[PDB]
Amino acid sequence: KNPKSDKFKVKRFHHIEFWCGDATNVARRFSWGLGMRFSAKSDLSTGNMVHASYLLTSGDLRFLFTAPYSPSLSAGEIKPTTTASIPSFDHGSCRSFFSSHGLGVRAVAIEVEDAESAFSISVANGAIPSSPPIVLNEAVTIAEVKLYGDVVLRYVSYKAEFLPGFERVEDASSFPLDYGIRRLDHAVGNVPELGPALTYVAGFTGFHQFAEFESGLNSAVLASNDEMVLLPINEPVHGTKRKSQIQTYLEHNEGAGLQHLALMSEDIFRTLREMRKRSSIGGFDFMPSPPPTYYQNLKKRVGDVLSDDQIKECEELGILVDRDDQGTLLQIFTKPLGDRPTIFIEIIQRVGCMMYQSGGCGGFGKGNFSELFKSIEEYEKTL
Amino acid sequence: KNPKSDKFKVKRFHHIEFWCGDATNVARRFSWGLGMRFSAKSDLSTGNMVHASYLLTSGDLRFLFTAPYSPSLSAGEIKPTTTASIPSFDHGSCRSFFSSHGLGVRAVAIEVEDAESAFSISVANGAIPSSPPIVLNEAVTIAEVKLYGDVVLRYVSYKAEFLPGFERVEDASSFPLDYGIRRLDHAVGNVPELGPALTYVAGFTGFHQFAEFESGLNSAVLASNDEMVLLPINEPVHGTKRKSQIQTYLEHNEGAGLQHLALMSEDIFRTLREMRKRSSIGGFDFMPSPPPTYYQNLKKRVGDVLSDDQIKECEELGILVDRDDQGTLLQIFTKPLGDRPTIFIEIIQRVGCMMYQSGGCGGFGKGNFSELFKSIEEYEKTL
Ligand SMILES: Cc1c(C(=O)C2=C(O)CCCC2=O)ccc2c1c(=O)n(CC(=O)OCCOc1ccc3ccc4cccc5ccc1c3c45)c(=O)n2C
Ligand SMILES: Cc1c(C(=O)C2=C(O)CCCC2=O)ccc2c1c(=O)n(CC(=O)OCCOc1ccc3ccc4cccc5ccc1c3c45)c(=O)n2C
Ligand SMILES: [Co+2]
Ligand SMILES: [Co+2]
C-alpha cells in the first residue's frame, strides 16, 4: 500500500554533502575510488573566503565535499555580506560536527518543487528547523531541517548550475572518470530508537512506510510518493551473540548519523571490477566475500534471473543477490570510508519492476542476513 | 665552512607526521599521488583506542598520517594505561592544531643516537619542551621539542619495526607502488621573523648555517654535522610588487608552520611522469611550467651537465634546473597539498658532489627566482 501522503512535492535525491577536515584530499580519494569526475567548485579561487567545497558527479549522483577555512579570512563578514556559497554553512558547526563524528554526511539533499514551502510545511508538522529558506541569486532556494543526529535533510528548489557561486571545473582538472555509477538509490540512518525516529521524520514529510518482503538490528524504510526517495532507518538489537553493528556505529560516531549510501550502477559488474582494481591503490575496500556455498545456493534462488556465467561473475566480484516478490537486487558493501567504523557505501543494481523501473525494486537485501549465515554454516560443513 | 657544532649525534631524517582530520583518506590520496606503499598501521585493529596512524614508505622516506578517534573510546585511560602508540599524542592538541592550521606537518622527526640525551641537551640550550623522552617497549625512545609554530622536532633513537605497537600492513592492502622517491632531502619552515627563528633552532641543536651560492622572502638553511639534515627557514619581505607568498602562507596557516617537504628521487624523470599521469585522477597537481625560453636558456647554463634530449625531457615535465659552484639541482613544485595555500611538496634530484653524494649538492634553487623572471620576460618578448 502507498497512501501517497507527501506533504509537499518531492522530486529526487539531489546531492549528499560530506563535512570534512580537508575537502581536497577526501574529494580526490573518492573521485579515484568511485569513478566520479570533478564538476564544480566553490573555494578561494571563486571568491569564497569561508569554506572550500568540491562537487563530484557520476551520472545523476552528486557528492559534495566541504571544509572550513580559517575563520580569520572572513572575520569581517556578516551573513548579509557573506562570501560563502552555501549560506547554511557555519565554521563552528562544521568543526564541532567533524570533531564529534569524524568524516561523514552532514546533508541529505532532495530536490523539491518549492524549498520555502517544503520548509514551512515541514516545520509546521514537527520538523526541527536547522537553516531557514535562503534564495540564492534569485534562482535557487535552499533550506534545512534536522533529520537525525547532526544530519540535516536539505531542500533545494530551482526556478529553472549546481548552486550559484559554484564554478564549473577546468577541463584539465576534470578527468572523465566513470565506473558506471548513476544515482543515489537510498540513504540509511542509524539511531538509538527506531520508533521515535520514524514518527518524527514521517510526521513532517508525509513519507510512508515502504513495504518489505538475530542480525542485531531493526529497520524500516520511509518513502516519497513515487518511492524514488528512500530513507531506511536502523536501530540496534541488544544482547545478541555478536555485538550489534548498529551499536558499534553509535558508539564510534558519538550517536545517530548516516550509516550508508547506496549507489545505483547501470552495470554493477563493471563498477565492481573497476573499484576492486583500485582498492589498494587509493580507492575503497570491500567486505569479505561470501563462501562459494553462497554462490552455489544462488542457482536455486535466482537461477531464473541470472545465468550460470552471470552467477560466476557475481562470485568473482563478491556480489550479493537478494529477491523479493517483485524484483532482484545485486548489492555489495564497502569497508568504512574513513578512520571510524561508521559510514560505508553500498553498490547496487536492481532487476525487474519494469513499468521506467519502480523505486526499491527487489527490496534492500534483508534476506541476505540469513542466507549469509546459512552459507557460512554450510561452508564450515564443506571443509 | 662547516664548524660541525651539533650538540648531540644526529643521523638522518626519520619520518614526517601529518596531523589529519581523517588519516585514512589523506593516506590513501598521498599513496596514489606519490607512489608510496602502506607499510605499517596503529589503529583500532591493533588495539589503539586513541588515534589512527598510517605509515607510507618509499625507499627511506616515511610519511605518517594520524587522526584522533572520539575521546570517548579511551575516556577510562590515563597516560600510564594508554593504548596510544605515540605517547606524545593528545586529542585536544591534535584537534586544535587541525582547526587552526588545516592539514599539515606536526612533526619533523630525526633519528639521533640517544633521544633522551638529545632532549636534555636541547632543553638545556633553549629548546622549548613539547613531550618528554618516553621509552617504548624498552626498544625505542621518542622526545619532542618545539621547532616553529605548532611544529615539533621529534627525536627518535633505537636500541637496535617503525615504532612499537605498529603492525606491518597485510600484503593485500600493501600494493608495491613506487615512482622513484627515495628520501626526504629537506624540510622548510615559514616564520614571521627569520632572525629569532634561526637563533632559537641553531641555539639548541648546534646546527650551522649551510652555505648558499624581489622574490618576497629571505631565507637561511640550518644543517647537521654531515649536512644530511637540512632545515631551511623563510620569512616574508613586505611591500613587494606581488604579495609575498610567505605572508600569504602565514595568513592562511594562522602563523608559522612547515611550508614544504623536498623529496629526493633517484629518477626525477620517471617520478614526474608517474605523478603527472595521476594529477587529475586523485594525485597531485604541479605549478605551471616555465616558458620555452626557460628551456632554451638551459643550454647556456647546464649544457655541460644535461644533453639536449635530457633538457627536452625537463621541458616536457616542467622541471626546473639550478646550479651552484659544486652541483646541479633538478626540482619541481606541486600545488598545495590540501585546501589551504600553505603546505606543498618539492621533488628534487641532485647531480654532482660525489665523494656517496654530499648533502645539499647544488643548493636549493634560489637562482631559479631570477631565471624564471627573466625567462617569463623573455617569453613576452618572444610573443
Ligand atoms: C547494510 C546492509 C543491508 C542494508 O542495506 C539495509 C538497508 O539498506 C535497509 C534495511 C536494513 C539494512 O540493513 C543489507 C544487507 C547487508 C548489509 C550489511 O551491511 N552487511 C554487512 C554487515 O552486516 O556488516 C557487518 C559485517 O559482518 C561480518 C563480520 C565478519 C565477517 C567475517 C567474514 C565474513 C565472510 C563472508 C561474509 C561475511 C559477511 C559479513 C561479515 C563477515 C563475513 C551485510 O552483510 N548485509 C547482508
Ligand atoms: C620553494 C621554492 C624554492 C625553495 O625550495 C626554497 C628552499 O628550499 C630554501 C631556500 C628558499 C626557498 O625558497 C626554490 C625555488 C622556488 C620555490 C618555489 O616555491 N617556487 C614557486 C613559488 O614561488 O610559488 C609561487 C608561484 O609564483 C607564481 C605565480 C604565478 C605564476 C604564473 C605563471 C607562471 C608560469 C610559469 C612559471 C611560474 C612560476 C611561478 C609562478 C607562476 C608561474 C619557485 O618558483 N621556485 C623557483
Ligand atoms: Co542498503
Ligand atoms: Co626546497
A186 known member of a binding site? yes
Domain termination site, one of A178, A207, A229? A178
Q: Are residues B68 and B185 in the same domain?
A: no
Instruction: Identify all chain B residues contacting A90, using CB atoms and an 8 Å cutoff.
Output: none
Task: Give the 3-state secondary structure of chain A.
Answer: CCCCCCCCCEEEEEEEEEECCCHHHHHHHHHHHHCCEEEEEECHHHCCCCEEEEEEEECCEEEEEEEECCHHHHCCCCHHHCCCCCCCCCHHHHHHHHHHHCCEEEEEEEEECCHHHHHHHHHHCCCCEEEEEEEECCCEEEEEEEEECCEEEEEEEECCCCCCCCEECCHHHCCCCCCCEEEEEEEEEECCCHHHHHHHHHHHHCCEECCCCCCCEEEEEEECCCCCCEEEEEEECCCCCCCCHHHHHHHHHCCCEEEEEEEEECCHHHHHHHHHHCCCCCCCCECCCCCHHHHHCHHHHHCCCCCHHHHHHHHHHCCEEEECCCEEEEEEEECCCCCCCCCEEEEEEEEECECCECCCCCCCCCHHHHHHHHHHHHHHHCC
Cβ B73–A251 below 8 Å, yes or no?
yes
User: What are the angstrom distances between the C-alpha of A135 and each of A12, A86, A172, A331?
Assistant: 20, 11, 32, 39
Q: Are residues A170 and A208 in the same domain?
A: no
Q: Are residues B266 and B119 in the same domain?
A: no
Who lines ligand 2 at CB under 6 A? Answer: B 188, 217, 219, 232, 234, 245, 260, 287-288, 290, 320, 333, 346, 364-366, 368-369, 372
**Residue A239: CA count within 13 A, CB half-sphere:** 0
User: What are the angstrom distances between the C-alpha of B316 and each of B270, B273, B302?
Assistant: 12, 9, 17
Q: Tell me which residue range forms the domain holding B209.
A: 179-383
Domain termination site, one of A123, A156, A178? A178
Helix (H) or strand (E) segment spanning residue B61: strand B61-68
Q: How was this structure determined?
A: X-ray
**Among candidates A44, A173, A338 on the partner chain, residue whose Cβ is nearest the Cβ of B280:** A173
A51 known member of a binding site? no
Q: Are residues A264 and A225 in the same domain?
A: yes
Q: Are residues B29 and B95 in the same domain?
A: yes
A144 known member of a binding site? no
Q: Are residues B198 and B172 in the same domain?
A: no
Q: How far apart are CA B281 and CA A36, in angstroms?
A: 9
Q: Are residues A136 and A240 in the same domain?
A: no
Closest CA to B289 of B257, B319, B266, B309: B319
Interior CA angle at B183 toward B181 and B186, to 5°? 115
Q: Are residues A173 and A192 in the same domain?
A: no
Q: Are residues B226 and B84 in the same domain?
A: no
Q: Which residues contact A255 (CB under 8 A, 6 or more apart)?
A: A100, A101, A149, A192
Q: Are residues A161 and A242 in the same domain?
A: no
Closest CA to B309 of B293, B298, B294: B298
Q: How many CB atoms lie within 10 A of CB B59?
A: 16
Cβ B100–A70 below 8 Å, yes or no?
yes
**Among candidates A28, A70, A175 on the partner chain, residue whose Cβ is nearest the Cβ of B254:** A70
Domain termination site, one of B146, B178, B210? B178
Q: Which residues contact A154 (CB under 8 A, 6 or more apart)?
A: A14, A17, A88, A107, A108, A109, A110, A142, A143, A144
**Among candidates B38, B100, B339 on the partner chain, residue whose Cβ is nearest the Cβ of A22:** B339
Collect residues with CB below 5 Å from ion ligand 3.
A 262, 346, 364
* Measured torsion, CA atoms of residues A62, A68, A73, A76, in degrees rounded to the nearest 10: 90
Cβ A22–B282 below 8 Å, yes or no?
no
Residues B104, B96: contact at Cβ < 8 Å? Answer: no
The number of folded domains in chain B is: 2
* Best mutation site among B333, B369, B377 for ligand 2 pocket (most ligand atoms within 8 Å of CB): B333
Q: Are residues A141 and A282 in the same domain?
A: no
Q: Nearest ligand to the C-alpha of residue A263?
A: 3
Q: Are residues A243 and A346 in the same domain?
A: yes
Q: Residues followed by a break in chain A, C–N over 2.5 Å? A: 160, 213, 355
Q: Which residues contact A90 (CB under 8 A, 6 or more apart)?
A: none
* Best mutation site among A190, A194, A231, A333 for ligand 1 pocket (most ligand atoms within 8 Å of CB): A333
Burial of residue A84 (number of CB atoms within 10 Å: 0-12, 13-18, 19+): buried
